[PDB]
mmCIF file of all heavy atoms in Angstrom:
data_model
loop_
_atom_site.group_PDB
_atom_site.id
_atom_site.type_symbol
_atom_site.label_atom_id
_atom_site.label_comp_id
_atom_site.label_asym_id
_atom_site.label_seq_id
_atom_site.Cartn_x
_atom_site.Cartn_y
_atom_site.Cartn_z
ATOM 1 N N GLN E 37 4.916 2.466 -2.938
ATOM 2 C CA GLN E 37 5.652 1.670 -3.951
ATOM 3 C C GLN E 37 6.605 2.676 -4.611
ATOM 4 O O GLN E 37 6.217 3.826 -4.844
ATOM 5 C CB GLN E 37 4.791 1.079 -5.030
ATOM 6 C CG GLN E 37 5.570 0.306 -6.105
ATOM 7 C CD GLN E 37 4.565 0.033 -7.219
ATOM 8 O OE1 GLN E 37 3.795 0.841 -7.694
ATOM 9 N NE2 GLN E 37 4.423 -1.197 -7.660
ATOM 10 N N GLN E 38 7.802 2.239 -4.895
ATOM 11 C CA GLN E 38 8.794 3.089 -5.554
ATOM 12 C C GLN E 38 9.437 2.342 -6.736
ATOM 13 O O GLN E 38 10.033 1.267 -6.519
ATOM 14 C CB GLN E 38 9.904 3.592 -4.602
ATOM 15 C CG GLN E 38 10.737 4.684 -5.323
ATOM 16 C CD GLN E 38 11.872 5.125 -4.423
ATOM 17 O OE1 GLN E 38 12.364 4.387 -3.560
ATOM 18 N NE2 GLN E 38 12.308 6.389 -4.627
ATOM 19 N N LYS E 39 9.341 2.905 -7.927
ATOM 20 C CA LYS E 39 10.005 2.244 -9.063
ATOM 21 C C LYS E 39 11.310 3.032 -9.258
ATOM 22 O O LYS E 39 11.512 4.159 -8.778
ATOM 23 C CB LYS E 39 9.192 2.240 -10.295
ATOM 24 C CG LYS E 39 7.714 2.391 -10.017
ATOM 25 C CD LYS E 39 6.841 1.669 -11.025
ATOM 26 C CE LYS E 39 7.076 0.164 -11.001
ATOM 27 N NZ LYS E 39 6.954 -0.256 -9.566
ATOM 28 N N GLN E 40 12.200 2.352 -10.014
ATOM 29 C CA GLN E 40 13.526 2.890 -10.316
ATOM 30 C C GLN E 40 13.505 4.305 -10.889
ATOM 31 O O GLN E 40 12.789 4.546 -11.896
ATOM 32 C CB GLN E 40 14.260 1.969 -11.303
ATOM 33 C CG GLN E 40 15.734 2.343 -11.368
ATOM 34 C CD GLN E 40 16.460 1.922 -10.124
ATOM 35 O OE1 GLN E 40 16.843 2.813 -9.397
ATOM 36 N NE2 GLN E 40 16.659 0.631 -9.893
ATOM 37 N N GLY E 41 14.256 5.175 -10.235
ATOM 38 C CA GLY E 41 14.282 6.568 -10.716
ATOM 39 C C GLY E 41 13.007 7.371 -10.644
ATOM 40 O O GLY E 41 12.785 8.335 -11.412
ATOM 41 N N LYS E 42 12.098 7.060 -9.747
ATOM 42 C CA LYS E 42 10.834 7.753 -9.523
ATOM 43 C C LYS E 42 10.666 7.903 -7.993
ATOM 44 O O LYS E 42 11.294 7.224 -7.172
ATOM 45 C CB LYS E 42 9.608 7.023 -10.033
ATOM 46 C CG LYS E 42 9.635 6.595 -11.495
ATOM 47 C CD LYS E 42 9.290 7.826 -12.328
ATOM 48 C CE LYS E 42 8.286 7.539 -13.437
ATOM 49 N NZ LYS E 42 8.787 6.563 -14.428
ATOM 50 N N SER E 43 9.810 8.838 -7.645
ATOM 51 C CA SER E 43 9.513 9.080 -6.224
ATOM 52 C C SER E 43 8.472 8.008 -5.832
ATOM 53 O O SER E 43 7.784 7.348 -6.653
ATOM 54 C CB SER E 43 9.095 10.520 -6.016
ATOM 55 O OG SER E 43 7.893 10.669 -6.728
ATOM 56 N N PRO E 44 8.417 7.801 -4.519
ATOM 57 C CA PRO E 44 7.497 6.817 -3.946
ATOM 58 C C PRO E 44 6.055 7.176 -4.274
ATOM 59 O O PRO E 44 5.746 8.358 -4.453
ATOM 60 C CB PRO E 44 7.801 6.879 -2.440
ATOM 61 C CG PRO E 44 9.152 7.506 -2.356
ATOM 62 C CD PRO E 44 9.186 8.526 -3.497
ATOM 63 N N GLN E 45 5.165 6.226 -4.359
ATOM 64 C CA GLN E 45 3.763 6.486 -4.664
ATOM 65 C C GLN E 45 2.916 5.782 -3.589
ATOM 66 O O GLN E 45 3.140 4.590 -3.266
ATOM 67 C CB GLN E 45 3.377 6.075 -6.087
ATOM 68 C CG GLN E 45 3.786 4.663 -6.406
ATOM 69 C CD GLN E 45 4.018 3.842 -7.625
ATOM 70 O OE1 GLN E 45 5.090 3.713 -8.261
ATOM 71 N NE2 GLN E 45 2.915 3.122 -7.996
ATOM 72 N N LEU E 46 1.957 6.555 -3.127
ATOM 73 C CA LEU E 46 1.031 6.034 -2.100
ATOM 74 C C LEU E 46 0.173 4.866 -2.586
ATOM 75 O O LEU E 46 -0.475 5.033 -3.644
ATOM 76 C CB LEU E 46 0.163 7.210 -1.578
ATOM 77 C CG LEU E 46 -0.804 6.781 -0.457
ATOM 78 C CD1 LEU E 46 -0.053 6.486 0.843
ATOM 79 C CD2 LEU E 46 -1.792 7.914 -0.268
ATOM 80 N N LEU E 47 0.155 3.767 -1.841
ATOM 81 C CA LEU E 47 -0.697 2.655 -2.215
ATOM 82 C C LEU E 47 -1.906 2.504 -1.260
ATOM 83 O O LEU E 47 -3.070 2.379 -1.654
ATOM 84 C CB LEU E 47 -0.017 1.295 -2.231
ATOM 85 C CG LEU E 47 1.130 1.076 -3.196
ATOM 86 C CD1 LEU E 47 1.914 -0.167 -2.761
ATOM 87 C CD2 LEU E 47 0.582 0.921 -4.599
ATOM 88 N N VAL E 48 -1.574 2.437 0.002
ATOM 89 C CA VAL E 48 -2.492 2.182 1.104
ATOM 90 C C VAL E 48 -2.202 3.079 2.273
ATOM 91 O O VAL E 48 -1.026 3.369 2.500
ATOM 92 C CB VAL E 48 -2.224 0.703 1.543
ATOM 93 C CG1 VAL E 48 -3.084 0.234 2.720
ATOM 94 C CG2 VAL E 48 -2.297 -0.283 0.398
ATOM 95 N N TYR E 49 -3.247 3.436 2.981
ATOM 96 C CA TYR E 49 -3.119 4.283 4.195
ATOM 97 C C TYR E 49 -4.184 3.718 5.175
ATOM 98 O O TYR E 49 -5.151 3.007 4.870
ATOM 99 C CB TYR E 49 -3.211 5.780 3.918
ATOM 100 C CG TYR E 49 -4.498 6.217 3.233
ATOM 101 C CD1 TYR E 49 -5.535 6.785 3.982
ATOM 102 C CD2 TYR E 49 -4.704 6.079 1.878
ATOM 103 C CE1 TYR E 49 -6.745 7.156 3.376
ATOM 104 C CE2 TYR E 49 -5.890 6.452 1.271
ATOM 105 C CZ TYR E 49 -6.915 7.000 2.022
ATOM 106 O OH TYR E 49 -8.084 7.351 1.372
ATOM 107 N N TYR E 50 -3.964 4.101 6.409
ATOM 108 C CA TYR E 50 -4.715 3.708 7.596
ATOM 109 C C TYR E 50 -4.919 2.191 7.571
ATOM 110 O O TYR E 50 -6.003 1.633 7.747
ATOM 111 C CB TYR E 50 -6.021 4.544 7.800
ATOM 112 C CG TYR E 50 -6.405 4.330 9.257
ATOM 113 C CD1 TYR E 50 -5.612 4.810 10.292
ATOM 114 C CD2 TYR E 50 -7.564 3.617 9.578
ATOM 115 C CE1 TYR E 50 -5.918 4.634 11.633
ATOM 116 C CE2 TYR E 50 -7.886 3.416 10.916
ATOM 117 C CZ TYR E 50 -7.073 3.920 11.927
ATOM 118 O OH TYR E 50 -7.465 3.671 13.224
ATOM 119 N N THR E 51 -3.828 1.518 7.314
ATOM 120 C CA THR E 51 -3.722 0.062 7.226
ATOM 121 C C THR E 51 -4.408 -0.627 6.048
ATOM 122 O O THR E 51 -3.777 -1.495 5.437
ATOM 123 C CB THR E 51 -4.225 -0.635 8.565
ATOM 124 O OG1 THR E 51 -3.443 -0.105 9.680
ATOM 125 C CG2 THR E 51 -4.106 -2.166 8.595
ATOM 126 N N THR E 52 -5.660 -0.342 5.739
ATOM 127 C CA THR E 52 -6.413 -1.043 4.734
ATOM 128 C C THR E 52 -7.009 -0.209 3.631
ATOM 129 O O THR E 52 -7.560 -0.856 2.722
ATOM 130 C CB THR E 52 -7.597 -1.875 5.442
ATOM 131 O OG1 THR E 52 -8.568 -0.846 5.869
ATOM 132 C CG2 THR E 52 -7.198 -2.772 6.615
ATOM 133 N N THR E 53 -6.932 1.091 3.705
ATOM 134 C CA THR E 53 -7.539 1.883 2.606
ATOM 135 C C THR E 53 -6.627 2.094 1.408
ATOM 136 O O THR E 53 -5.562 2.721 1.563
ATOM 137 C CB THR E 53 -7.971 3.318 3.111
ATOM 138 O OG1 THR E 53 -8.783 3.095 4.300
ATOM 139 C CG2 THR E 53 -8.675 4.093 2.010
ATOM 140 N N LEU E 54 -7.094 1.654 0.252
ATOM 141 C CA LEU E 54 -6.359 1.830 -1.004
ATOM 142 C C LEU E 54 -6.464 3.280 -1.491
ATOM 143 O O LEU E 54 -7.547 3.873 -1.325
ATOM 144 C CB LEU E 54 -6.965 0.874 -2.028
ATOM 145 C CG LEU E 54 -6.795 -0.617 -1.880
ATOM 146 C CD1 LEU E 54 -7.230 -1.326 -3.143
ATOM 147 C CD2 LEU E 54 -5.324 -0.916 -1.671
ATOM 148 N N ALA E 55 -5.386 3.803 -2.021
ATOM 149 C CA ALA E 55 -5.401 5.175 -2.595
ATOM 150 C C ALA E 55 -6.167 5.066 -3.941
ATOM 151 O O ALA E 55 -6.381 3.994 -4.561
ATOM 152 C CB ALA E 55 -3.984 5.709 -2.741
ATOM 153 N N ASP E 56 -6.612 6.203 -4.438
ATOM 154 C CA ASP E 56 -7.377 6.218 -5.710
ATOM 155 C C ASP E 56 -6.542 5.639 -6.839
ATOM 156 O O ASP E 56 -5.367 5.993 -6.935
ATOM 157 C CB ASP E 56 -7.890 7.632 -6.064
ATOM 158 N N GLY E 57 -7.155 4.804 -7.655
ATOM 159 C CA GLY E 57 -6.395 4.241 -8.782
ATOM 160 C C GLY E 57 -5.497 3.069 -8.503
ATOM 161 O O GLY E 57 -4.851 2.548 -9.441
ATOM 162 N N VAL E 58 -5.417 2.632 -7.237
ATOM 163 C CA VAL E 58 -4.576 1.461 -6.946
ATOM 164 C C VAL E 58 -5.426 0.237 -7.268
ATOM 165 O O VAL E 58 -6.564 0.175 -6.806
ATOM 166 C CB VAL E 58 -4.084 1.545 -5.480
ATOM 167 C CG1 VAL E 58 -3.500 0.200 -5.056
ATOM 168 C CG2 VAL E 58 -3.090 2.671 -5.249
ATOM 169 N N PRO E 59 -4.865 -0.696 -7.983
ATOM 170 C CA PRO E 59 -5.546 -1.957 -8.348
ATOM 171 C C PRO E 59 -5.930 -2.682 -7.069
ATOM 172 O O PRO E 59 -5.166 -2.619 -6.097
ATOM 173 C CB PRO E 59 -4.556 -2.736 -9.209
ATOM 174 C CG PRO E 59 -3.233 -2.039 -9.066
ATOM 175 C CD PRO E 59 -3.489 -0.652 -8.521
ATOM 176 N N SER E 60 -7.072 -3.333 -7.057
ATOM 177 C CA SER E 60 -7.610 -4.056 -5.898
ATOM 178 C C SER E 60 -6.871 -5.344 -5.547
ATOM 179 O O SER E 60 -7.194 -5.954 -4.508
ATOM 180 C CB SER E 60 -9.092 -4.406 -6.067
ATOM 181 O OG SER E 60 -9.177 -5.227 -7.236
ATOM 182 N N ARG E 61 -5.900 -5.665 -6.394
ATOM 183 C CA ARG E 61 -5.038 -6.828 -6.187
ATOM 184 C C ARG E 61 -4.107 -6.579 -4.987
ATOM 185 O O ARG E 61 -3.451 -7.497 -4.523
ATOM 186 C CB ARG E 61 -4.205 -7.223 -7.394
ATOM 187 C CG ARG E 61 -3.014 -6.413 -7.789
ATOM 188 C CD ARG E 61 -2.373 -7.076 -8.994
ATOM 189 N NE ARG E 61 -1.477 -6.172 -9.665
ATOM 190 C CZ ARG E 61 -1.745 -5.197 -10.518
ATOM 191 N NH1 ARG E 61 -2.992 -4.910 -10.929
ATOM 192 N NH2 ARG E 61 -0.786 -4.430 -11.048
ATOM 193 N N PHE E 62 -4.123 -5.337 -4.530
ATOM 194 C CA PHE E 62 -3.316 -4.948 -3.357
ATOM 195 C C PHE E 62 -4.173 -4.941 -2.105
ATOM 196 O O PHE E 62 -5.267 -4.343 -2.306
ATOM 197 C CB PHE E 62 -2.814 -3.527 -3.578
ATOM 198 C CG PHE E 62 -1.619 -3.451 -4.513
ATOM 199 C CD1 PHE E 62 -1.802 -3.184 -5.861
ATOM 200 C CD2 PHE E 62 -0.331 -3.657 -4.015
ATOM 201 C CE1 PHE E 62 -0.710 -3.080 -6.716
ATOM 202 C CE2 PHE E 62 0.782 -3.543 -4.843
ATOM 203 C CZ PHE E 62 0.584 -3.251 -6.188
ATOM 204 N N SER E 63 -3.755 -5.481 -0.983
ATOM 205 C CA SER E 63 -4.651 -5.299 0.184
ATOM 206 C C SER E 63 -3.767 -5.242 1.448
ATOM 207 O O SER E 63 -2.794 -6.047 1.493
ATOM 208 C CB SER E 63 -5.741 -6.317 0.403
ATOM 209 O OG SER E 63 -5.050 -7.556 0.401
ATOM 210 N N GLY E 64 -4.133 -4.334 2.324
ATOM 211 C CA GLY E 64 -3.294 -4.282 3.549
ATOM 212 C C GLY E 64 -4.109 -4.782 4.761
ATOM 213 O O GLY E 64 -5.342 -4.683 4.730
ATOM 214 N N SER E 65 -3.377 -5.235 5.783
ATOM 215 C CA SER E 65 -4.052 -5.680 7.016
ATOM 216 C C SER E 65 -3.101 -5.455 8.184
ATOM 217 O O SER E 65 -1.915 -5.120 7.924
ATOM 218 C CB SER E 65 -4.457 -7.131 6.839
ATOM 219 O OG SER E 65 -3.351 -7.968 6.725
ATOM 220 N N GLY E 66 -3.641 -5.598 9.399
ATOM 221 C CA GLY E 66 -2.758 -5.435 10.580
ATOM 222 C C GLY E 66 -3.396 -4.660 11.703
ATOM 223 O O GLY E 66 -4.498 -4.112 11.570
ATOM 224 N N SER E 67 -2.698 -4.648 12.822
ATOM 225 C CA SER E 67 -3.092 -3.884 14.010
ATOM 226 C C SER E 67 -1.880 -4.019 14.970
ATOM 227 O O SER E 67 -1.067 -4.927 14.712
ATOM 228 C CB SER E 67 -4.334 -4.294 14.824
ATOM 229 O OG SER E 67 -4.202 -5.683 14.989
ATOM 230 N N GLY E 68 -1.911 -3.140 15.952
ATOM 231 C CA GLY E 68 -0.823 -3.185 16.958
ATOM 232 C C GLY E 68 0.553 -2.938 16.365
ATOM 233 O O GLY E 68 0.855 -1.841 15.876
ATOM 234 N N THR E 69 1.420 -3.938 16.378
ATOM 235 C CA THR E 69 2.785 -3.830 15.858
ATOM 236 C C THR E 69 3.021 -4.692 14.646
ATOM 237 O O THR E 69 4.173 -4.841 14.247
ATOM 238 C CB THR E 69 3.770 -4.273 17.036
ATOM 239 O OG1 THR E 69 3.347 -5.621 17.408
ATOM 240 C CG2 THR E 69 3.758 -3.405 18.305
ATOM 241 N N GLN E 70 1.977 -5.296 14.063
ATOM 242 C CA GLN E 70 2.122 -6.257 12.930
ATOM 243 C C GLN E 70 1.188 -5.900 11.804
ATOM 244 O O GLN E 70 -0.054 -5.845 11.948
ATOM 245 C CB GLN E 70 1.783 -7.561 13.653
ATOM 246 C CG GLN E 70 2.088 -8.777 12.952
ATOM 247 C CD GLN E 70 3.567 -9.066 12.902
ATOM 248 O OE1 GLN E 70 4.165 -9.349 13.945
ATOM 249 N NE2 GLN E 70 3.965 -8.958 11.630
ATOM 250 N N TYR E 71 1.780 -5.594 10.661
ATOM 251 C CA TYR E 71 1.049 -5.143 9.463
ATOM 252 C C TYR E 71 1.499 -5.908 8.242
ATOM 253 O O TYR E 71 2.676 -6.311 8.088
ATOM 254 C CB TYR E 71 1.272 -3.621 9.217
ATOM 255 C CG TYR E 71 0.758 -2.861 10.408
ATOM 256 C CD1 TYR E 71 1.540 -2.697 11.554
ATOM 257 C CD2 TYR E 71 -0.571 -2.376 10.428
ATOM 258 C CE1 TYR E 71 1.012 -2.070 12.695
ATOM 259 C CE2 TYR E 71 -1.075 -1.727 11.575
ATOM 260 C CZ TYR E 71 -0.289 -1.577 12.691
ATOM 261 O OH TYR E 71 -0.818 -0.923 13.797
ATOM 262 N N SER E 72 0.548 -6.026 7.341
ATOM 263 C CA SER E 72 0.950 -6.768 6.131
ATOM 264 C C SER E 72 0.402 -6.202 4.862
ATOM 265 O O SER E 72 -0.668 -5.574 4.833
ATOM 266 C CB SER E 72 0.426 -8.154 6.606
ATOM 267 O OG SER E 72 0.826 -9.027 5.619
ATOM 268 N N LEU E 73 1.149 -6.381 3.781
ATOM 269 C CA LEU E 73 0.777 -5.983 2.435
ATOM 270 C C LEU E 73 0.865 -7.268 1.573
ATOM 271 O O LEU E 73 1.887 -7.967 1.396
ATOM 272 C CB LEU E 73 1.588 -4.859 1.789
ATOM 273 C CG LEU E 73 1.093 -4.440 0.406
ATOM 274 C CD1 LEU E 73 -0.200 -3.656 0.518
ATOM 275 C CD2 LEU E 73 2.170 -3.540 -0.235
ATOM 276 N N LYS E 74 -0.308 -7.532 1.044
ATOM 277 C CA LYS E 74 -0.523 -8.673 0.145
ATOM 278 C C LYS E 74 -0.827 -8.217 -1.292
ATOM 279 O O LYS E 74 -1.704 -7.373 -1.557
ATOM 280 C CB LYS E 74 -1.747 -9.455 0.624
ATOM 281 C CG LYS E 74 -1.863 -10.705 -0.249
ATOM 282 C CD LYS E 74 -2.929 -11.680 0.279
ATOM 283 C CE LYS E 74 -2.604 -12.097 1.706
ATOM 284 N NZ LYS E 74 -2.414 -13.575 1.857
#
């Protein structure tokens, strides 16, 4: 995620793992060539 005038911040990695401190309202899914962020 990147806000105005700030560097990007890690939310999710390895498709579904949330980084520390990311609200659980975020969730990733996917495999192959199709991925999603909800």
Side-chain angles (χ1 to χ4, degrees), residues 37-55 57-74:
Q37 177 191 47
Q38 190 183 27
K39 338 212 62 51
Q40 193 73 249
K42 307 280 225 298
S43 64
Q45 51 200 89
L46 182 71
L47 298 163
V48 179
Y49 58 100
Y50 198 66
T51 303
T52 72
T53 309
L54 291 192
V58 167
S60 60
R61 74 178 163 280
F62 281 96
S63 54
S65 65
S67 47
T69 57
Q70 193 74 67
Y71 299 84
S72 185
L73 183 73
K74 186 171 301 240

